[PDB]
Ligand binder design. Sequence first.
Ligand code: NI
Length: 341
Amino acid sequence: TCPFYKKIPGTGFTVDAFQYGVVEGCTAYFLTHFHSDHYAGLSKHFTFPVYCSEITGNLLKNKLHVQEQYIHPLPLDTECIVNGVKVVLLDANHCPGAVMILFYLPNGTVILHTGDFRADPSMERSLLADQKVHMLYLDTTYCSPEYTFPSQQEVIRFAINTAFEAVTLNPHALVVCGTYSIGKEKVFLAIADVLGSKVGMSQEKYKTLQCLNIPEINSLITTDMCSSLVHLLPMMQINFKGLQSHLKKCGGKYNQILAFRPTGWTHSNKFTRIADVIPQTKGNISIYGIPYSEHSSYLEMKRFVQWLKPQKIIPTVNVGTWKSRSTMEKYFREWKLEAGY
Ligand code: NI
């Protein structure tokens, strides 16, 4: 059964609700972004209209084999009419093709569904600025003050300098970057760019990246591993065993691995500055965990919500425990009282 925070009242619409079969009364299914917890249940047998961004559409077609006739891509920042209801898709500053959805209900209510997002002050000069929002469906992934992490820019700076330094000292070192979905591409692209290399990867990953409308992508990635000194591997293989094994495969082209595991937050963020991050090392293998987030920090989420001043907030993450729910409602009330809405 579809939970309440996936239904848009006063419409035939659901958001990210493909794992409950045919939802009763649903005339259109919205998909905010191509991450598995959100698309769970789509496949080539799906026969209802799916509304999403162009990039999400490319992935639905090519990776999941959803038939073209059911894929409805919409442009961003544009007022569109879907089954008699005005909607707008906004950039969510999450992974490629991730959107927030604005719904203008026939009765005058305005709903913002953030999908997954990393709130940013630039959102304060989208089409959001123009009108009032009554309900916010909020990505509350890191809705607690302990969740701090740096900007994406500072993390990338750290990784670029780390990689460049290592390979300049040892021209026979290999850089590996872990991945398990789309998003966080800037980590491996930025490192490859500073080293003058393409990024080597499996055919399945290369296929995925070709769906993302990244400019000049054919100049950045390749399936020829041996020509490349930045390799992508599944996140699961980013460990001493997996990387030892991978080093065997390159045929003594390389005598050192420097690997990056982008995580979201880890508790090493309560104590350590990004500048101060050190790897775990075993022999000629080093693994850095770097806190590259595509979700809002606590501070970024609070600022967005205080700016938006919604009338009601419905969290879409961490909703399964009474303790989490209660914690989140407390922070919403503080935020409201502090800003005076
Ligand atoms: Ni996501």
